[PDB]
């Protein structure tokens, strides 16, 4: 029977589901617009540095 | 019958003023119900017509080998080897 | 007062939940000990998981005849067990020799070497009767640490 | 095929007990199943039977809460159920209170007892013979 | 008769070689072996949980020892030392004295569970059918002293199993 | 930082709830009932083991070693749980300058857990299980990097973020047909619950990194060894699976990503029950002798393909 097997899968559909949603939904409180900027190479890093310098002041990433 | 200590079953003394028996104190000692052969004489004696009658517990099904008992002494009760069943006449 | 009394039962609930046996391949009793892993009469994740190694396990099941050649061997295995340990001597050999007993080599009853908490009397220890050896074990764990 | 399988599970929960009854057969009982019941037993055992399922299986049966004086609903053992183990559950086909008659003796114990093991009032060893008597007189 | 385990090479030419090479290059037969336990997962398990469900048995079965009695009282055991001699473990001990007046049945009767291999020998050797083996399973003790049976008493307390014994012995007389 | 703490505690629970699946799915594979008594379906048993093995179980080895031994379960968890950080997911925790390089380096560093457990006991009985664990891992580290390189040259660079975007229409299983079959075997390089596996399970020899360890260190080893199985299952679901991306809705990705990984999570325990151990000598002959010329031929093939038809990130 699978009625015993499926609760073993459903309990995994909660705990393994957490790390995906917890990383994404935390971007609401950390940043204004639910997005964390990708760094990779200095070109994209410089755009973040000038954004924080230009009238955002304290905030790292902010629109206008 | 019991005196001070636990009740005796099938004639067995416990201890004289408690010396040997000490282990049976925390745990309760066992006792068999009707072990003094009180049920042996409780069964009524059967009447017979023949000089000798064969005894059985309950046919061939229950464990009783066939024993012939003579009922001619009159004064004697007349009982088989396996049972305490008494026979007269 | 009440939280302290219930916390001790919570620690004892872990031993009530699961206990790992030792695969003592000592005699014919060990074959019926393999029948505990057999599906028809199972304790597999009912409260028993076979893994071996005396260092990891909680319960050791002495499954058969012990001799003078085996008396030093089994003793230190029991010493290799973690301190909350339970010994289940299963079978007439484990209780004092099936026949034997008056023999030269066989040590009588395991209790001469290692202390036993739960006894199973069955030669061919029927899996039905074997299930008590783990269920009564969990029932015997009642109270630990008052002060 | 798929619709009948989900309906079979819902009917099993609805038949036996209800909402509070289904939880008692899930938390305390390992496997939940509904069918026919024998009913009549000493202390208060349920004793269920007449189920197909698999070979060598005769339904849930279930153990009674507080049989003699243990007072346990979560803890259960094979000490439960009166002199009736030779039928329904194993060996015999006829039911102990329905078809198969229990033999009277007027010597057998009326109230069934559970094995104590660790609890007081348990098994004990005892001496039998009066041995060689010794006497000393002043 | 000779069955022969050797196949003597199934591959020969073109068609018989390439399919035998295909299973060794990738897998195929291992995926076929993977599908063998797939169907085994789909079918229901034949499992019995003990505290509620019970396993199959027989009308004649041996467990813990219990001695029987006659329908109108009285001890069925006659004291022979018969069952003592048959016993390969010598677990059963018997010493007898006359019971008050008339009947002569037992004084010492210990069956040690430290020994006893469970033969059914003492069940068969007994002419009066005193020791009749019941379908017992539950026996677990703290000490050896609690395990081994005393002078009848606990063996006499087989009355709780004697109701099953009477049903089992009905299959015993005129054997099966 | 809250994200790291929200990726250890629910992840340790996933390794805890694995113990159910380790004998439920494996149980039904062997036609036997697994977890049943403890919870509603034995769901209270995985959390019971944490109360069982840590609070009450006390052992420390006899002859032992000095600081090392107890250093090894710290090395077990503190190098295998860190592997969760470079994972791309819907969104990664500190997206690496090069992704898979950190994944390959820390996996080889995670092997040291079974290596330092050899010197846990000074006695020679434990180190035989360690020496066997060397060769059962050392050879398979060769192909693990090579088969990666053939996939990485096919799609993007080392960055794990680009590996999600590259699979928009079809999976990478179909172009890398023999290479995908290799990653059911090469993933089992680390001491995992499998048929190929390494010197960790009992069966023939004594249990490696378990005979020396207690319960408390030994319990900490399982929380790391079974954690690597999920890690390889997710990593295969990035390199070979993808289906869809969707940056606007993270909800549609999170459900779809888990189902793909869970089907692979069952597949390793499917392998474990089905087949016997490959032997110390003959596992060294499966790869190196037989599989290494095959993987390099496909590596040769995957070098030419971006030159034959344009395929450069
Ligand atoms: N240092 C030495 O070696 C030394 C030197 C000179 C003389 N001595 C003498 O030799 C003896 C050595 O004994 P020990 O110290 O080895 O014994 P111990 O380890 O203290 O063990 C005594 C046991 O009795 C129980 N117990 C004692 N008092 C109790 C109370 N008030 N309530 C409940 N349980 C109680 C304890 O149980 P719980 O743990 O469950 O409470 C404990 O397990 C001493 O009595 C001392 O006079 C010793
Ligand atoms: S008690 Fe019986 S089954 Fe067990 S080892 Fe001894 S002879 Fe074999
Ligand atoms: S049990 Fe049977 S054979 Fe043994 S002494 Fe009693 S009557 Fe005789
Ligand atoms: S079953 Fe065998 S070993 Fe046990 S008491 Fe009877 S004759 Fe002796
Ligand atoms: Zn008679």
Q: Please give the share of residues in helix of chain D.
A: 10-25%
Main β-sheet, spatial strand arrangement of chain B? 1-4
Number of separate strands of chain B: 4
- The quaternary structure here is part of a larger assembly
Biggest interface reads: D-E, 46 and 48 residues
Heterogens: NADP nicotinamide-adenine-dinucleotide phosphate, iron/sulfur cluster, zinc ion
Tally of individual helices of chain B = 0
Pattern of helices and strands of chain D: HHEE
Strand order of the largest sheet of chain D: 1-2
Helix content of chain B: under 10%
Shape of chain D: elongated
User: Care to count the β-strands of chain D?
Assistant: 2
CA-based gyration radius of chain B: 20 Å
Strand content of chain B: 5-15%
Keywords (chain A): Electron transport, Membrane, Mitochondrion, Mitochondrion inner membrane, Respiratory chain, Transmembrane, Transmembrane helix, Transport
InterPro entries (chain A): NADH_Ub_cplx-1_asu_su-1
Subunit structure (chain A): Complex I is composed of 45 different subunits.
Family (chain A): Belongs to the complex I NDUFA1 subunit family.
Task: Walk me through the structure.
Chain B: This is NADH dehydrogenase [ubiquinone] iron-sulfur protein 6, mitochondrial. Chain B: It comes from Bos taurus. Chain B: It is found in: Mitochondrion inner membrane. Chain B: Belongs to the complex I NDUFS6 subunit family. This is part of a larger assembly, with chains A (64 residues), B (89 residues), C (147 residues), D (138 residues), E (176 residues) and F (313 residues). Chain A is mainly α. Chain A has one domain (1-64). Chain A contains 5 helices and no strands. Chain C is mainly α and 147 residues long. Helix content of chain C is 33%, strand content 8%. Chain C has helices at residues 3-17, 29-34, 71-80, 92-96, 127-130, 132-140; strands spanning 59-62, 86-90, 118-120. Chain C has a 3-stranded parallel sheet. Chain F is mostly helical. Chain F has helices spanning 9-16, 18-29, 45-53, 71-80, 99-109, 112-115, 124-138, 140-154, 162-165, 177-182, 216-225, 227-239, 250-274, 280-286, 292-308. In chain F, helix 2 crosses helix 13, helix 4 runs parallel beside helix 11 (216-225) and helix 8 packs parallel to helix 15 (292-308). Chains D and E meet through loops of D and strand 2, helix 6 and helix 7 of E.
């Amino acid at each position: 029977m699978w009625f015993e097997v499926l609760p073993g899968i459903a309990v995994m559909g909660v705990c393994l589901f957490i790390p995906g949603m917890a990383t994404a939904r935390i971007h609401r409180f950390s940043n204004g617009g639910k997005e964390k900027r990708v760094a990779h190479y200095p070109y994209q890093w410089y755009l973040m540095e000038r954004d924080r310098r230009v009238s955002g002041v304290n905030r790292s990433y902010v629109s206008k | 019958x019991x005196x001070x200590x636990x009740x005796x079953x099938x004639x067995x003394x416990x201890x004289x003023x408690x010396x040997x028996x000490x282990x049976x104190x925390x745990x309760x000692x066992x006792x068999x119900x009707x072990x003094x052969x009180x049920x042996x004489x409780x069964x009524x004696x059967x009447x017979x017509x023949x000089x000798x009658x064969x005894c059985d517990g309950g046919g061939g099904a229950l464990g009783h080998p066939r024993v012939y008992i003579n009922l001619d002494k009159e004064t004697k009760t007349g009982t088989c080897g396996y049972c305490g069943l008494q026979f007269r006449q | 007062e009440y939280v302290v009394a219930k916390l001790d039962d919570l620690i004892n609930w872990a031993r009530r939940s699961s206990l790992w046996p030792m695969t003592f391949g000592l005699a014919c009793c060990a074959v019926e000990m393999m029948h505990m892993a057999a599906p028809r009469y199972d304790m597999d994740r009912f409260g028993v998981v076979f893994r071996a190694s005396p260092r990891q396990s909680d319960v050791m099941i002495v499954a058969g005849t012990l001799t003078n050649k085996m008396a030093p061997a089994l003793r230190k295995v029991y010493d290799q067990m973690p301190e909350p340990r339970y010994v289940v001597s299963m079978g007439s050999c484990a209780n004092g020799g099936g026949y034997y007993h008056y023999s030269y080599s066989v040590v009588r009853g395991c209790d001469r070497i290692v202390p036993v908490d739960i006894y199973v009397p069955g030669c061919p220890p029927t899996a039905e009767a074997l299930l008590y050896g783990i269920l009564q074990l969990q029932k015997k764990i009642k109270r630990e640490k008052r002060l | 095929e798929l619709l009948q399988v989900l309906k079979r599970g819902l009917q099993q929960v609805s038949g036996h007990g209800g909402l509070r009854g289904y939880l008692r057969v899930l938390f305390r009982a390992n496997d939940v199943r509904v069918g026919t019941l024998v009913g009549e037993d000493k202390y208060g055992n349920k004793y269920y039977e007449d189920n197909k399922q698999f070979f060598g299986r005769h339904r849930w049966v279930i153990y009674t809460t507080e049989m003699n004086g243990k007072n346990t609903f979560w803890d259960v053992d094979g000490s439960m159920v009166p002199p009736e183990w030779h039928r329904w559950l194993h060996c015999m086909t006829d039911d102990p209170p329905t078809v198969k008659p229990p033999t009277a003796r007027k010597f057998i114990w009326t109230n069934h007892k559970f094995n104590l093991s660790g609890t007081p009032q348990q098994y004990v060893p005892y001496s039998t013979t009066r041995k060689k008597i010794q006497e000393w007189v002043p | 008769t000779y069955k022969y385990v050797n196949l003597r090479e199934p591959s020969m030419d073109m068609k018989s070689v390439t399919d035998r090479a295909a299973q060794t290059l990738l897998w195929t037969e291992l995926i076929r072996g993977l599908g063998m336990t797939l169907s085994y997962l789909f079918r229901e398990p034949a499992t019995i949980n003990y505290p509620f469900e019970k396993g199959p048995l027989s009308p004649r079965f041996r467990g813990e020892h219990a001695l029987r009695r006659y329908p109108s009282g009285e001890e069925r055991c006659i004291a022979c030392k018969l069952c003592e001699a048959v016993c390969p473990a010598q677990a059963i001990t018997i010493e007898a004295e006359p019971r008050a007046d008339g009947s002569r049945r037992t004084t010492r009767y210990d069956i040690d569970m430290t020994k006893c291999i469970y033969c059914g020998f003492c069940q068969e050797a007994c002419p009066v059918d005193a020791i009749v083996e019941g379908p017992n399973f539950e026996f677990s003790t703290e000490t050896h002293e609690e395990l081994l049976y005393n002078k009848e008493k606990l063996l006499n307390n087989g009355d709780k199993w004697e109701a099953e014994i009477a049903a089992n012995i009905q299959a015993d007389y005129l054997y099966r | 930082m809250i994200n790291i703490l929200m990726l250890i505690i629910p992840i340790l629970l996933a390794v805890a709830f694995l113990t159910l699946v380790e004998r439920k799915v494996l149980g039904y594979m062997q036609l036997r009932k697994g977890p049943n008594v403890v919870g509603p379906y034995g769901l209270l048993q995985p959390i019971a083991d944490a109360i069982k093995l840590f609070i009450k179980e006390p052992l420390r080895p006899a002859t032992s070693s000095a600081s090392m031994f107890i250093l090894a379960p710290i090395m077990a968890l503190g190098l295998a749980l860190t592997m969760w950080i470079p994972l791309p997911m819907p969104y990664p925790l500190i997206n690496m300058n090069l992704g898979v390089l950190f994944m390959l380096a820390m996996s080889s560093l995670a092997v040291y857990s079974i290596l330092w457990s050899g010197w846990a006991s000074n006695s020679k009985y434990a180190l035989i299980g360690a020496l066997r664990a060397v060769a059962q891992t050392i050879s398979y580290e060769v192909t693990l990097a090579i088969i990666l390189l053939s996939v990485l040259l096919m799609s993007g660079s080392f960055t794990l973020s680009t590996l999600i975007t590259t699979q928009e229409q079809m999976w990478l299983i179909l172009p890398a047909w023999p290479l995908a079959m290799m990653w059911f075997i090469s993933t089992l390089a680390e001491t995992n619950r499998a048929p190929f596996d390494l010197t960790e399970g009992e069966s023939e020899l004594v249990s490696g990194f378990n005979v020396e360890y207690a319960a408390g260190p030994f319990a900490l080893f399982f929380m790391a060894e079974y954690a690597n199985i999920i890690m390889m299952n997710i990593f295969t679901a990035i390199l070979f699976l993808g289906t869809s991306h969707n940056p606007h809705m993270p909800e549609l990705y999170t459900i779809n990503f888990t189902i793909k990984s869970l089907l692979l999570t069952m597949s390793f325990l499917w392998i474990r029950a089905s087949y016997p151990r490959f032997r110390y000598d003959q596992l060294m002959h499966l790869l190196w002798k037989n599989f290494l010329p095959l993987t390099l031929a496909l590596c040769m093939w995957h070098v030419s393909l971006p030159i034959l038809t344009s395929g450069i990130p």
